[PDB]
Amino acid sequence: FRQDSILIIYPRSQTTLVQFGLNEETFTVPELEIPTQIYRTTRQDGSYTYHSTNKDNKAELIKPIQNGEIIDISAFTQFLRLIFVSILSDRANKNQDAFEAELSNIPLLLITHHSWSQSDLEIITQYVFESLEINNLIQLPASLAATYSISLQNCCIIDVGTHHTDIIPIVDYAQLDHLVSSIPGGQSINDSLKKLLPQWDDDQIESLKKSPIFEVLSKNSDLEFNTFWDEKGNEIKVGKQRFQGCNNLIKNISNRVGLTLDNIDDINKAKAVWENIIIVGGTTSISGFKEALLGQLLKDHLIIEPEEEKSKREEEAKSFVPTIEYVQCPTVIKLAKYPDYFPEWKKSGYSEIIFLGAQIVSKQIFTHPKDTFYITREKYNKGPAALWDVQF
Amino acid sequence: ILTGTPLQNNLPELWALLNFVLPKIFNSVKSFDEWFNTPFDKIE
Amino acid sequence: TLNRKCVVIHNGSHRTVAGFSNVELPQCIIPSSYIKRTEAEFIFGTYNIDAAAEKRNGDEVYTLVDSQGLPYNWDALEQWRYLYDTQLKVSPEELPLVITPATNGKPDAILERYYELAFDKLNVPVFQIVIEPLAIALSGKSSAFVIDIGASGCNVTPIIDGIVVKNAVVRSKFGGDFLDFQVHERLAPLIKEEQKRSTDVWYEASTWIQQFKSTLQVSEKDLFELERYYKEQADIYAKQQENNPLVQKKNFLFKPLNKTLTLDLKECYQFAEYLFKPQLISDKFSPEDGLGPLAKSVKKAGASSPEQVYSLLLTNVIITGSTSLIEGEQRIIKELSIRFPQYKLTTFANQVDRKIQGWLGALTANLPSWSLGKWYSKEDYETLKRD
Amino acid sequence: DPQTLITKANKKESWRYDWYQPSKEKYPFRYKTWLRNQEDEEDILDLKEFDRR
Amino acid sequence: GLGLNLQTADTVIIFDTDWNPHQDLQAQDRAHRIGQKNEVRILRLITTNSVEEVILERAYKKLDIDGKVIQAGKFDNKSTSEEQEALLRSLLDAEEER
Amino acid sequence: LKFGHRLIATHTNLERDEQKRAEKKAKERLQALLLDQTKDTRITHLLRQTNAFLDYYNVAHRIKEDIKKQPSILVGGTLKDYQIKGLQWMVSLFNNHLNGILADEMGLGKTIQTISLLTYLYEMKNIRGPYLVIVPLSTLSNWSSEFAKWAPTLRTISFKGSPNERKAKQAKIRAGEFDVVLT
Numbered sequence A: 001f002r003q004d005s006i007l008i009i010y011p012r013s014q015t016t017l018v019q020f021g022l023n024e025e026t027f028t029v030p031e032l033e034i035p036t037q038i039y040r041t042t043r044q045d046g047s048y049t050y051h052s053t054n055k056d057n058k059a060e061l062i063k064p065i066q067n068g069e070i071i072d073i074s075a076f077t078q079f080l081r082l083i084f085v086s087i088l089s090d091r092a093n094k095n096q097d098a099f100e101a102e103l104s105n106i107p108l109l110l111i112t113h114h115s116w117s118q119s120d121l122e123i124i125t126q127y128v129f130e131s132l133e134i135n136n137l138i139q140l141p142a143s144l145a146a147t148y149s150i151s152l153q154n155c156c157i158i159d160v161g162t163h164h165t166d167i168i169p170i171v172d173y174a175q176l177d178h179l180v181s182s183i184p185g186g187q188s189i190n191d192s193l194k195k196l197l198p199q200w201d202d203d204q205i206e207s208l209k210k211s212p213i214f215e216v217l218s219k220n221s222d223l224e225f226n227t228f229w230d231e232k233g234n235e236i237k238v239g240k241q242r243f244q245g246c247n248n249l250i251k252n253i254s255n256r257v258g259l260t261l262d263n264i265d266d267i268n269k270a271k272a273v274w275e276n277i278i279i280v281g282g283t284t285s286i287s288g289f290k291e292a293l294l295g296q297l298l299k300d301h302l303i304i305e306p307e308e309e310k311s312k313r314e315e316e317a318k319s320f321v322p323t324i325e326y327v328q329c330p331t332v333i334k335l336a337k338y339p340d341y342f343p344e345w346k347k348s349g350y351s352e353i354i355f356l357g358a359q360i361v362s363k364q365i366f367t368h369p370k371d372t373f374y375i376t377r378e379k380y381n382k383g384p385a386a387l388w389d390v391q392f
Numbered sequence B: 001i002l003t004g005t006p007l008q009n010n011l012p013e014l015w016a017l018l019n020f021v022l023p024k025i026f027n028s029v030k031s032f033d034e035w036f037n038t039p040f041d042k043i044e
Numbered sequence C: 001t002l003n004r005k006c007v008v009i010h011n012g013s014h015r016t017v018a019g020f021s022n023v024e025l026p027q028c029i030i031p032s033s034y035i036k037r038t039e040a041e042f043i044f045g046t047y048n049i050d051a052a053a054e055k056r057n058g059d060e061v062y063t064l065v066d067s068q069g070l071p072y073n074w075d076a077l078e079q080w081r082y083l084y085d086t087q088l089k090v091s092p093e094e095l096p097l098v099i100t101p102a103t104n105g106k107p108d109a110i111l112e113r114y115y116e117l118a119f120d121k122l123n124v125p126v127f128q129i130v131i132e133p134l135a136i137a138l139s140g141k142s143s144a145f146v147i148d149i150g151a152s153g154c155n156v157t158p159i160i161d162g163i164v165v166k167n168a169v170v171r172s173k174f175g176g177d178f179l180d181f182q183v184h185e186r187l188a189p190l191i192k193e194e195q196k197r198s199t200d201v202w203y204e205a206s207t208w209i210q211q212f213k214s215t216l217q218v219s220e221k222d223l224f225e226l227e228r229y230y231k232e233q234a235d236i237y238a239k240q241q242e243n244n245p246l247v248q249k250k251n252f253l254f255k256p257l258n259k260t261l262t263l264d265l266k267e268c269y270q271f272a273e274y275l276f277k278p279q280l281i282s283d284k285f286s287p288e289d290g291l292g293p294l295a296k297s298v299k300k301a302g303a304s305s306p307e308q309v310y311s312l313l314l315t316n317v318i319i320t321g322s323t324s325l326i327e328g329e330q331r332i333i334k335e336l337s338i339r340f341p342q343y344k345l346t347t348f349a350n351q352v353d354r355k356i357q358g359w360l361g362a363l364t365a366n367l368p369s370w371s372l373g374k375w376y377s378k379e380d381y382e383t384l385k386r387d
Numbered sequence D: 001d002p003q004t005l006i007t008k009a010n011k012k013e014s015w016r017y018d019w020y021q022p023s024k025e026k027y028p029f030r031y032k033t034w035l036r037n038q039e040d041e042e043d044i045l046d047l048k049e050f051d052r053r
Numbered sequence E: 001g002l003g004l005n006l007q008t009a010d011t012v013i014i015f016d017t018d019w020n021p022h023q024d025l026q027a028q029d030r031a032h033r034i035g036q037k038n039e040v041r042i043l044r045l046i047t048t049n050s051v052e053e054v055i056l057e058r059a060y061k062k063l064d065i066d067g068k069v070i071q072a073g074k075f076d077n078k079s080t081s082e083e084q085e086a087l088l089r090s091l092l093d094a095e096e097e098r
Numbered sequence F: 001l002k003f004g005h006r007l008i009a010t011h012t013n014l015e016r017d018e019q020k021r022a023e024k025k026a027k028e029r030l031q032a033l034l035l036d037q038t039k040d041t042r043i044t045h046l047l048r049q050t051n052a053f054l055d056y057y058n059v060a061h062r063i064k065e066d067i068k069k070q071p072s073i074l075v076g077g078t079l080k081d082y083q084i085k086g087l088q089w090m091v092s093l094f095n096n097h098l099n100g101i102l103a104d105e106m107g108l109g110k111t112i113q114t115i116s117l118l119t120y121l122y123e124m125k126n127i128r129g130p131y132l133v134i135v136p137l138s139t140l141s142n143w144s145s146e147f148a149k150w151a152p153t154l155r156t157i158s159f160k161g162s163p164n165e166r167k168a169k170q171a172k173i174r175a176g177e178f179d180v181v182l183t
């Protein structure tokens, strides 16, 4: 397929990143960022006409996705219509031959979430091939589109949007459905920010959440108070709470990642996922949230000869330090690496790197003949039962 | 590598000496062919 | 196969494992127990651990399913609504159903209760009940000698040409939960701590007892035999020079204390010795209750030619179960190759997928004919409702 | 029009999620599955508006 | 050339006259060893008006070429700093003698 | 798995296309508005050899250790300053996970230092397992005789001659129960 024909869509808990037309040398930041939202005019006959704008205030702003989950599947397929049709019309205005070049056959690469149901993705394929009439479709998961950003085989995907946190173990490029645990999102970061900065509002604490002076401790730190600027350009100073706020969610994710990855009967894949902890989402432009999340993981779930007993047998050694040999799995806890060879993504950050691995997957599979990973039109001639035939 | 002597006096396989022993210079193999000119106005 | 999306559920004595036929993984693996949070709140779900991390007063992890593989809390198991909506996110009335312990032919009832559970309680329009040790034999073998060391115990089932040798199906007591009691019992001085407490005991069986279990062992011979042999080996190594493999520390890091719990190799062996020798824990349990002479389930299968049954079983051994994923199968090979050396033990086992092997066998759902298994219509309830 | 752009795009069955009754003939139960739909079985935003820049 | 480790060998004679000088110096140190109780003497039996002196001429021709490599490789033991320039002047006068 | 490791190769392409972008961009920028690049960058590459491979006297031999005693399994061998310095420099090369060339003249204990390599490091680590030593066919048994007299408890596997005698050894030690293969 053509990378100018490639459409990549990531609806997240607030915003939907859309890119049509890859940058094709290094992949770009997803240029379009809609909110994850579509107005629906309930036409009085019960039919629904779907708009991007509040059409005569009979339209209701239906977010198709918050907390990652599809929360209106028909409005999500019509938000796929709203985005897709917009790509078609905008390339019918800007390019106008793209209906033979970019819109002649759009390999629609849609980023899915763990909380999207089976009937959700089947109705997605139905509306995509019958009502969107899209002959070629990947439903790429957000965890795999995170893990292919450096084709990581075993990792932990922590989708911290502003609203929700997924903890998703990936083993052999595949998600454990029984171990995915979604605990709440930068609103839990905002929540302990409000616990620690009571005098502020949601705009001040959210601008702190998108401030450069936002860290977690586990120089901004040597300063007691630091000054960032509000959305209206007002200088706001903050004490040690700019080293805090994320720490409550850090402990919540940390205990949830421990209870996720220590319950595995396979003692070895636990450590390989334990050393590739990935934390993604529009919140995760916060500095130090991933760092103190790792530090709290090492605080809660790192198996070692503990400092009482390792100090005791440091003293037994000074009588070369041996370690009391434990049997448990989480003995090494580490994070994973981000591809620095994308200057568009080096510049525009890796907080939404799910789109980056989606771009890499799109240049892989679509520019390949491999329809083992996308449904063809003839493959629809098993339908969304061929959606079950085109998974990775 | 244990040896009582290095390679031949002309020494072009100083690469192959250093390549099997070290991961140093196997990327640009054609580097030091101009820089092996040291073994082959006597003062200048 | 046929155009179907069946629901594949394995209900073990401790684990409720659920997904569909068109997904080869379960959508969830929650307990077949519940932290009855106390309102009564039958908290199913593994992490919903965290409620039992509160260890709350009134929170009571009762099982739904006892040690026979049959549920004793069926409407709290109707957990089935929790499965289909909070985990599967589908109507059970949409999809067909495959649900997985063998017996002697008497409780062939529970199906009526599943006529309750799939037609009345959930109105699943068709449900297929499969035999779980026969499902483990399926995922492509016709006859087997299935030993499931699950949470319930060592469940031995002979299977000859697909039929169940009903007199020879023997299920032991000593599996996961008795070893939860055992690991809670022996590391009790080292954890310094020493159903309703199932919120203490099941929670510890979720946090550290399993962390001592997936990390327990079985001796490949008898531990008394391996113990005497390794003591003889260490005496040879000591007397020749002037080391025992059993004197080395398998320390456990009890994370509610962050403390070294030095149990040795023989010590971790001794827990799973009670599955083969439960006379070492209580006098009321014979070595026949252990897995070796459980041989007896081969011999009781000899009455269904008995040596042909022995040929089929002892050349078609099948190993499965949660507590069988504790290291040490070679104990089964040694312990039954001394009671039956005549047919060499060519065993089969899922080694991972072993703890959910009944689910994978029920998933094999994906049979190419609806006539290959008995799929119960609502009319099949109506026929079973008559006479 | 959105449907005109859509039919102008990506260039074919339809499929349904329906009760099938399976055959042995038909079983006295029925069940949902994705059955093959046979042959006889809005608005636009302009882009570069939500473009992050 | 690589056959033996002998501490009692004394006298070395070479007829083939070093087609490879590294082959000659490899077989050269088989006489003197740690614990050598004899006194080593080395002879190269070369006839006048023949070609074997030309290889003996080309012996110390080739021995000077690796003299800037392998006899410059000799002070590189403990990363010396002044031992290079001492061997840069002293070995140069021995190369001047020939 | 075919696809996921296809992307591993594709990630190498997107890196190397960026690397062929950037190194060419570096070669354009670093000389527009000799070999001393190989000095500082190969010092850091020695740190890549220590940590990521697993003054030049200091940055490579950073793990410092000097033990002038022979191994206890080295029995009946003469200790001078060469095989003390030859060991603990190579032990410093062993601790830093570095290879090297023992550029010594001759008679400096090539068998003495290698026995003291395996018998000392292994004495502490006690590994002395499937290690490879390959010597020329001219000196095979002399190394093996020195593998008998200068060190016990290190088993040796040879490879010589007609293929009939190898079938007894290499089917018995097919599973690899040895300390050294002397090939």
Ligand SMILES: Nc1ncnc2c1ncn2[C@@H]1O[C@H](COP(=O)(O)OP(=O)(O)O)[C@@H](O)[C@H]1O
Pocket: B004, E005, E006, E007, E033, E034, E035, F077, F078, F079, F080, F104, F105, F106, F107, F108, F109, F110, F111, F112
């Ligand atoms: N301390 C020592 N005492 C006695 N002999 C020694 C001592 N060190 C080395 N040797 C002699 O050196 C020989 C081994 O040297 P070798 O391994 O052949 O050196 P290389 O391999 O560098 O040529 C032995 O034959 C031994 O007799």
Ligand code: BEF
Pocket: B004, E004, E005, E006, E029, E030, F106, F107, F108, F110
């Ligand atoms: F290799 Be030399 F003869 F010790």
Ligand SMILES: [Mg+2]
Pocket: F110
């Ligand atoms: Mg030698």
